[PDB]
Amino acid sequence: MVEKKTSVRSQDPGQRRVLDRAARQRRINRQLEALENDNFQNFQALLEEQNLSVAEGPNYLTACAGPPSRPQRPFCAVCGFPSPYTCVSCGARYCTVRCLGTHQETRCLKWTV
């Protein structure tokens, strides 16, 4: 009988760990910076030199729109449909168990380094 070789990359649940607030905020900031960027999946130094001589007044700082009044809507991260759920590990949202599984397999805590 053919012996089906199994994978050895499985991780122990005793070693798997939940995430925190600072790392989630850094995730969000990185995702937004990537969405703003345009290259393979600099202006950082540009904005650094910019803020080097910025103050409070009629400028970019006091010109930014800011947060809106209508509350943030909970959209999904995998399929994009309305997501009433959240990921207890990282806080990501989802709408179905299939979406949760795809997130755990492809997104959950794998890009944070």
The annotation places the binding site for Zn(2+) at 76, 79, 87, 90, 95, 99, 103, 108
Nearer to another protein (CB atom), residue 59 or residue 74: 74
Answer for which of 77, 91, 107, 109 binds another protein (CB under 8 A) is 91
Residue 87 near another protein by CB under 8 A: yes
Tally of residues, the chain = 113
Rg (CA), the chain: 20
Residue owning tokens 């809507």: 73
Identify the CA nearest to 91 among candidates 74, 71, 67. Answer: 74
Residues that bind another protein (CB under 8 A): 84-88, 91, 96-97, 100
